[PDB]
């Protein structure tokens, strides 16, 4: 449990050195559950990278910090943020990664309305990432708009893998209470063993974000909302009259209480709602630097 013991363990798996030897002008842009995110300038090129900083002493489960290393080493994809290097800097784990200059989807859903071409484009991109992760046994466990980042030209990428877990023939299900209350699958709140299906439920909640601006029960305390997710029928759109029958049918395959009956990522890639998906260009006008 010793802090210095965990520092030593992390040193054996990260890259050697200190990225301050090649980065300038750190500017904090976000705060997450495990640390902060900064932009930095590569001194040699003038290019911008992102740097995630996580204090080992502030982690509820320090061992989840290895998730950043496992994902960086073994899982790369068009719709997953690319991670370049990891370092131990003092008491902090620093991950130098791709900078997604378009910011997070949260800023869009809380400030503007997406049309279904844009919603389908986000869902297709997320589902392509999840289909590849799930096929290799990786569960993200924190799908929500805050975890979805954008490039300046509207490309959509999944980020924040600090909470993921792996399943396999020898470990078929996970049991840990991990996620963000309003987005958690009911079987996970019920403390039942769960699998990749919980990301599909969370994606459904994110679809409700994209239509309503906020997840269900967001006005309720997080523990109250979890009880309602667990005990009540699947949450409803507040604006059901504002979604096409195609979107509603899509959402109906995501927000299924029985995880055996929930659609998988591979199945959802074939759903007709995703035929509405626009190109990344259709997402560009939603971002702060472009909207009015």
């Amino acid at each position: 449990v010793s802090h210095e013991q965990f520092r030593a363990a992390l040193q054996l798996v990260v890259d050697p050195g200190d990225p301050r030897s090649y980065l300038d002008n750190f500017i904090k842009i976000g705060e997450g559950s495990t640390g902060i995110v900064c932009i930095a300038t590569v001194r040699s090129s003038g290019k911008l990278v992102a740097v995630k900083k996580m204090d080992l002493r502030k982690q509820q489960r320090r061992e989840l910090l290895f998730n950043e290393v496992v994902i960086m080493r073994d899982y790369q994809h068009e719709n997953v943020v690319e991670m370049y290097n990891s370092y131990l800097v003092g008491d902090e784990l620093w991950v130098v990664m791709e900078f997604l200059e378009g910011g997070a989807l949260t800023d869009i859903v809380t400030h503007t309305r997406m049309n279904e071409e844009q919603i389908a484009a986000v869902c297709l991109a997320v589902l392509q990432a999840l289909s590849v992760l799930h096929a290799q046994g990786v569960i993200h466990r924190d799908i929500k708009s805050d975890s979805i980042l954008l490039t300046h030209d509207g490309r959509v990428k999944l980020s924040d893998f600090g909470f993921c877990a792996q399943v396999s023939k020898e470990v078929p299900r996970r049991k840990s209470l991990v996620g963000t209350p309003y987005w958690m699958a009911p079987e996970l709140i019920s403390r039942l063993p769960y699998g990749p299906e919980v990301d599909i439920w969370s994606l459904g909640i994110m679809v409700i974000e994209m239509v309503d601006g906020e997840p269900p029960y967001f006005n309720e305390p997080p523990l109250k909302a979890m009880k309602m997710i667990r005990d009540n029928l699947p949450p409803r759109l507040k604006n059901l009259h504002k979604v096409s029958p195609s979107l509603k049918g899509f959402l109906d395959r995501l927000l299924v209480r029985d995880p055996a009956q929930r659609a998988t990522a591979a199945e959802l890639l074939k759903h007709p709602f995703l035929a509405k998906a626009g190109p990344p260009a259709s997402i560009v006008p939603l971002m702060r630097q472009n909207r009015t």
Partner: peptide
């Protein structure tokens, strides 16, 4: 911090 991830006890 309503949007923050939680990790069970």
């Amino acid at each position: 911090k309503k949007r923050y991830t939680v990790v069970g006890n």
